[PDB]
Amino acid sequence: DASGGIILIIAAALAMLMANMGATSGWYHDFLETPVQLRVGALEINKNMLLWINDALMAVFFLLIGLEVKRELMQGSLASLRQAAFPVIAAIGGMIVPALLYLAFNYSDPVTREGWAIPAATDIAFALGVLALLGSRVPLALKIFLMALAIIDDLGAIVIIALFYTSDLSIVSLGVAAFAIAVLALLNLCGVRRTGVYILVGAVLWTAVLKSGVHATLAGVIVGFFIPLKEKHGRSPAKRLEHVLHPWVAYLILPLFAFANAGVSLQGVTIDGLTSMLPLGIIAGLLIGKPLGISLFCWLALRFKLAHLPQGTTYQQIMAVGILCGIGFTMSIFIASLAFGNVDPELINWAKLGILIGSLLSAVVGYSWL
Amino acid sequence: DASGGIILIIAAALAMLMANMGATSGWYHDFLETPVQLRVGALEINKNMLLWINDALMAVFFLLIGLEVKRELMQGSLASLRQAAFPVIAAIGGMIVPALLYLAFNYSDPVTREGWAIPAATDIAFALGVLALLGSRVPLALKIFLMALAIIDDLGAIVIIALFYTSDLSIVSLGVAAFAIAVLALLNLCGVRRTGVYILVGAVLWTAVLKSGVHATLAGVIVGFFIPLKEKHGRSPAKRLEHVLHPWVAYLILPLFAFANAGVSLQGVTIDGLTSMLPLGIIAGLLIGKPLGISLFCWLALRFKLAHLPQGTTYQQIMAVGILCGIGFTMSIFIASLAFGNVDPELINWAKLGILIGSLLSAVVGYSWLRAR
Numbered sequence: 001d002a003s004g005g006i007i008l009i010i011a012a013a014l015a016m017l018m019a020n021m022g023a024t025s026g027w028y029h030d031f032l033e034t035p036v037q038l039r040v041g042a043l044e045i046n047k048n049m050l051l052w053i054n055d056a057l058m059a060v061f062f063l064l065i066g067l068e069v070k071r072e073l074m075q076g077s078l079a080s081l082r083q084a085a086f087p088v089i090a091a092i093g094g095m096i097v098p099a100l101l102y103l104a105f106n107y108s109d110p111v112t113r114e115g116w117a118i119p120a121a122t123d124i125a126f127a128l129g130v131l132a133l134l135g136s137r138v139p140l141a142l143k144i145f146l147m148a149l150a151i152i153d154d155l156g157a158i159v160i161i162a163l164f165y166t167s168d169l170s171i172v173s174l175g176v177a178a179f180a181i182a183v184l185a186l187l188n189l190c191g192v193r194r195t196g197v198y199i200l201v202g203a204v205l206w207t208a209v210l211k212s213g214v215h216a217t218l219a220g221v222i223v224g225f226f227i228p229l230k231e232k233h234g235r236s237p238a239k240r241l242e243h244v245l246h247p248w249v250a251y252l253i254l255p256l257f258a259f260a261n262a263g264v265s266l267q268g269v270t271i272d273g274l275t276s277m278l279p280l281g282i283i284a285g286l287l288i289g290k291p292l293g294i295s296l297f298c299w300l301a302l303r304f305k306l307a308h309l310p311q312g313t314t315y316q317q318i319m320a321v322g323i324l325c326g327i328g329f330t331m332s333i334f335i336a337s338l339a340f341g342n343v344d345p346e347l348i349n350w351a352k353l354g355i356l357i358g359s360l361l362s363a364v365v366g367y368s369w370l
Numbered sequence: 371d372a373s374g375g376i377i378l379i380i381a382a383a384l385a386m387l388m389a390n391m392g393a394t395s396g397w398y399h400d401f402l403e404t405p406v407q408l409r410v411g412a413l414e415i416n417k418n419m420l421l422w423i424n425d426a427l428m429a430v431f432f433l434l435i436g437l438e439v440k441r442e443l444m445q446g447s448l449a450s451l452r453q454a455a456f457p458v459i460a461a462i463g464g465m466i467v468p469a470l471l472y473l474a475f476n477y478s479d480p481v482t483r484e485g486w487a488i489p490a491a492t493d494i495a496f497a498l499g500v501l502a503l504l505g506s507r508v509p510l511a512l513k514i515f516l517m518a519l520a521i522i523d524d525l526g527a528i529v530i531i532a533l534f535y536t537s538d539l540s541i542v543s544l545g546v547a548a549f550a551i552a553v554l555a556l557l558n559l560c561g562v563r564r565t566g567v568y569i570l571v572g573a574v575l576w577t578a579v580l581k582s583g584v585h586a587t588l589a590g591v592i593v594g595f596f597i598p599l600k601e602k603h604g605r606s607p608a609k610r611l612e613h614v615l616h617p618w619v620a621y622l623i624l625p626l627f628a629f630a631n632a633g634v635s636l637q638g639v640t641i642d643g644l645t646s647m648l649p650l651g652i653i654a655g656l657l658i659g660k661p662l663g664i665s666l667f668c669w670l671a672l673r674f675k676l677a678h679l680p681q682g683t684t685y686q687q688i689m690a691v692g693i694l695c696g697i698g699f700t701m702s703i704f705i706a707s708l709a710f711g712n713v714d715p716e717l718i719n720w721a722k723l724g725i726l727i728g729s730l731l732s733a734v735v736g737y738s739w740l741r742a743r
Contacts, residue, residue, distance in 0.1 A: 039407040040419075049410075196618070248566065 004250030005129015006172055008330070011255035012262035012356075019263030028263060045210055050260055055213050059206055059220040059255045064156070064249050065151060066224020067242040074229060077148040086308045087148040089301045090294045090318075095120040095153050096267060097293025098285035105281035111347070112278045115339035116167065117157040119285025122150040125239055125254050125331035125361065130201075130324055130367055139317065141310035146321045149294070154331050155221065162214040169215065173208050175355055177215075180205035184226040191228075195237045198227050214338050254330060261333045264352045278347070279354030286326040286358030287365075294322035320369035326362030328355045375499015378700070379624035382726075385633030398633055415636050416581060420630060420707075427627045428704055429576055429590040432528070436594015437612040439521050444599060447518040456671065456678040457460060457515055461522035463667025463743035464695055465490040468659030475651035481717070482648045484535060485525045485709040491653025492520035493699035493729070495624050500694060500737050509682030516691050519664075525591065531708055532584040539585065543578050547585075554596040557670050561675050563598050567606050584708055624700060631703045634722045644723060651662030652698070652724030657731050661692030690740035696732025698725045 019026040034049040047055075069078075078084040098119035106112040124147060131143055169177075183201050209215035227238040274280065298318050301307035306356035309315065330336075336351035388398040417425075442448040448457065457512075468489040476482040494517055501513055528534040539547075553571050562568075571591035579585035599608040644650070668688055671677035706721040 034411040036411075037407070037409040039405075039409070040407075041404045054408070196614075 002129045002132035004125050004133070004254070005132065007251060008125055008129070008254055009260055011258040012329075013288075015259045015261070015263035018259075020267070025265060032260060034038060034145075038298065042322050047211075051213065053260055054257065054334065054337060055216045057253050058213075058217045060245065061220070061249055061253050061257075062155075062217050063202075063220035063224045064242060064245045065155065066221040067227065067238045067245070068147075069151060069155065069221070070225055070227075070229055070238055071142075071242065072151075074146055077097075077144055080143075082308060084148075085306060086298065086301065086310065087145060088151045088152065089297045090145075091152040091156070091307070093293035093295075093297025093300075094122075094149065094290055095156065095293070096321070097296070098132050098289030099249050100283040101289040101292075105277040106282065109277060112281075112344065113319040115336055115347075115351065117161065117279075118332050118336045118339065118355070119282050119328060120157050120291050120356070121154050121328050121331035121335045122290070122325045123327045123331045124150045124154070124369070125250060126327045126329045126359070126363065127321070127324040130327070130363055131321070134367065134370060139310070139312045142317060142321060144315075145318075146324065149321070150325060153325075157335055158217055160213060161335070162212075162218050166212060166214055166341070169209055169212050173211070173327050177205055177219075180208065181222060184223065188228060189225050193228055196225060198223055198237075212266040213341070244308050249360075257334070258330050261337065262330070262352065262356065264349050264356075269353065273350075274353060274357065276350070278350045279357070282328075282332070282351060282354030282356040283361070285353070286328050286332070287323075287361050288326075290326035290362065291319055293323035294325060295319045298322075318368075320366055323366030323369070326366070327359040329359040332359070372499040372502035374624065375496050375503065376496055377501065377621060377625050378493075381628040382632040382699075385631070388629075388637075389633035389635050390637070395635060399635075402630060419582060423630055424627065424704065424707060425580065425586045426481070427623045428583075428587045430615075430620055431586050431627075433572075433594045434589030434612060434615050435521055435525065435590075436591035437597060437608050437615070438517075439525060439591070440595055440597075440608065441612070442518055442521075442600060443582075447514045453675070454678070456668065456680070457518045457522065458595040459671045459677065460664050460668050460713045461519055461526070462589050463663040464492075464660055464692075465523055465526060465663070467511065467663025467666070470652040471659035471662075472655040475647040475654070482651070482714065485648070485706060485717070485721060487531065488702050488709065488725065489652050489659050489698060489728070491524050491698050491701040491705045492518040492660075492695050493697045493701045494524070495620060495698045496693050496729070497691075497697040499678045500697075500733055504737065504741050509680065509687065511680040511682055512687060512691070515680050515688075516694065519691065519695065520701075523695075527668060527705055528584060528587055528591075531705070532582075533611050535709060536584050537582055539579060539582055543581065546578040547575055547589075550578060551639065554593065558598060559597045561650050563599075563600075563602065563607050565597065565611050568593055568597055582713070587716055604608060610628070627704070628700050631707065632700065632722070632726065634719055639723065643720075644727065646719050646720070649716065649724030649727070652702075652721060653728040654698040654727070656698050656702070656728030657693075657735070660696040660732065661689055663691040664692035664695055684743065686743055687740070690736060690743065693732050693736035693739065696736065697729045699729045702729070 016108060018024045032048065032050040036044045036047060036049055036052050043076070071303050072078040079085055099116045102119050103113060106116070127146055127150060131138060131146065135143070180201050180353075182206075184198065187197060189205065205222065206216050206219040209219060224238070227241060229236055229238045231239075274283075295318065298307075298315070302309070302315065332355045335350055336348055336355065338346040340351060375670060385398075388394045391624075400403065402418065402420040406417060406419055407421050409414045439448075442454075443450065448454045465487075469486040472486050472489050473483065497516055497520055498513065501508055505513070550571060557567060557571065574587040574590060578587050579589055597608045597611060599606055632690070644653075665688065668677065668685075672679070672685070676741060702725045703722055706718055706725060710717040728731065
């Protein structure tokens with residue numbers, strides 16, 4: 001139910017408490033920046049504590065998404081080219097319009113315009129938690145629409161970042177990554193169904209691209225795509241694994257990720273500081289860019305014939321979830337950590353402020369459409 | 371069946387090829403010798419590639435042992451209240467005589483006296499493997515007697531090495547370790563029946579004692595204890611975990627440990643070199659120390675009515691397990707790597723030579739004689 005949503009806010013509230021109390025804000029920041037060096041012979045992997053944690057947490061979190069994308073692409077909303085016509089059009093609008101509003105503020109600064117995909121992400125656990133809070137009798141199709149709409153935006157942003165803006169990996173790293181994916185394919189063609197063997201090869205895929213954070217995340221998506229879904233003898237590996245991971249993701253992965261990232265110091269924050277191009281551009285793309293692009297493109301889809309409509313929607317509850325897609329929260333925080341790495345350290349801190357202001361505003365306003 | 375015993379031999383044979391032919395002897399030695407360093411701020415751990423592998427593989431293997439030895443001690447072979455007090459007295463003899471026979475050779479050398487527990491271990495996968503090889507009609511109580519006999523020896527060897535022949539851990543490491551045992555015990559009393567919560571907590575215990583390979587192995591059996599075994603709603607967390615684990619242990623963890631440790635260079639190995647106090651002390655401790663220690667101790671317990679008897683015993687079939695308990699192999703190579711760490715690097719290599727010869731001779735004699743009776 002909505003239990004994952006509340007337990008996620010408590011984790012972020014404690015993180016905000018840790019980063020703003022004089023007795024804790026100091027050990028909290030110094031722990032996250034603790035250098036961790038693994039040196040295997042000549043190879044060494046240097047990255048701080050928070051980067052190791054995020055690369056491992058977001059790996060198993062996107063493993064669940066890869067299993068959920070595979071379900072909807074073969075059995076759910078995205079199964080047919082016509083049922084998927086409504087979430088995809090909503091995601092395109094739910095991404096280009098938030099990015100346009102963000103780039104409208106940050107186009108003049110070449111340093112901040114690289115994080116245009118920050119207001120395009122959507123916290124699935126937070127948005128689903130809001131729906132389940134009032135969801136005693138909300139349309140079930142809305143929950144599968146919101147989940148399908150939020151997944152493509154997050155997965156696309158991860159793919160778009162890992163395709164272009166990423167830094168290329170070692171020439172040896174891609175040779176092992178290609179071999180691990182080939183083993184994942186031969187394992188799928190030969191009909192093996194031991195889920196652990198896919199996890200085992202996934203570790204080699206995750207380790208080979210460890211230096212790149214967005215590729216270690218995509219490694220989980222690739223493993224989730226290759227785990228078979230067939231229902232032989234009434235059992236399915238991907239279906240079972242998605243069931244097993246869900247309590248661990250909703251109660252340990254996402255809460256820990258929120259506790260290590262959603263904590264910024266509020267000292268010195270002013271309204272004039274929050275109205276600067278970086279945070280306000282995130283607030284605009286989340287609070288306004290999300291519902292403006294989702295509503296417009298769905299409205300464009302509806303009138304201009306390429307459309308559909310989930311059973312029992314009424315197209316005024318679409319706008320309500322278009323506001324709930326403005327809850328970037330942990331997903332926009334992770335995207336901001338990828339785009340603002342190895343740059344000025346206050347870029348990520350201002351991004352987290354614009355996200356949390358926009359997310360809480362989009363949550364309260366979207367909830368108020370009872 | 372005996373599929374794990376064969377894979378365990380191909381991996382040891384592959385390791386022997388890797389550590390002998392010139393095209394791979396350079397890589398195989400330099401790979402296991404590769405130093406791996408993890409620096410967490412001020413903290414730092416330095417262990418070679420082989421130690422990082424052995425601490426990870428043997429911790430998983432002893433999680434299975436911790437599950438099996440709890441199944442027996444609570445509702446299985448060993449059980450409670452002296453049900454199977456017959457393998458317990460036999461295991462004392464399968465360790466006292468193998469160690470004393472070893473020390474008869476090495477007592478004059480203070481360096482090799484420390485490896486007295488090497489001929490006391492027993493490779494359960496290989497010893498059970500040769501049973502099932504011929505075993506269309508082997509007494510089933512005989513098999514479970516072996517498995518129960520080998521676990522008591524291997525667990526007692528790890529405990530003794532961890533209580534005396536181990537290195538000191540920091541008090542900060544013991545504090546987190548003790549706290550990890552407490553939250554494990556609180557998970558058990560409160561009725562938590564989810565395996566993943568125990569393994570996660572157990573991972574903290576393993577990393578806390580990571581600077582000691584013997585304690586990282588004990589972290590496996592301790593977590594194997596606190597996994598609940600109750601049958602609520604017809605489901606047991608320890609039984610499903612043991613069922614899931616067993617194929618991994620027999621097909622992945624055991625062969626990989628053999629491929630990484632059973633590889634020794636045979637160049638320069640003469641017959642005179644194999645009869646030194648260190649190798650020959652292991653040949654006698656396994657090929658002779660195990661049978662004489664097992665047979666005599668069951669016989670002294672049997673005659674004095676303190677013992678028992680398995681079903682389908684003969685008592686002439688028993689000592690066929692004695693020569694079968696001479697199978698040290700991977701379980702003795704691991705004990706040898708613990709007792710001969712941070713010393714002359716040829717002590718472990720000479721010990722591995724004495725472990726494989728005494729085991730192979732124990733396998734052939736143990737098989738060629740049990741097939742008769």
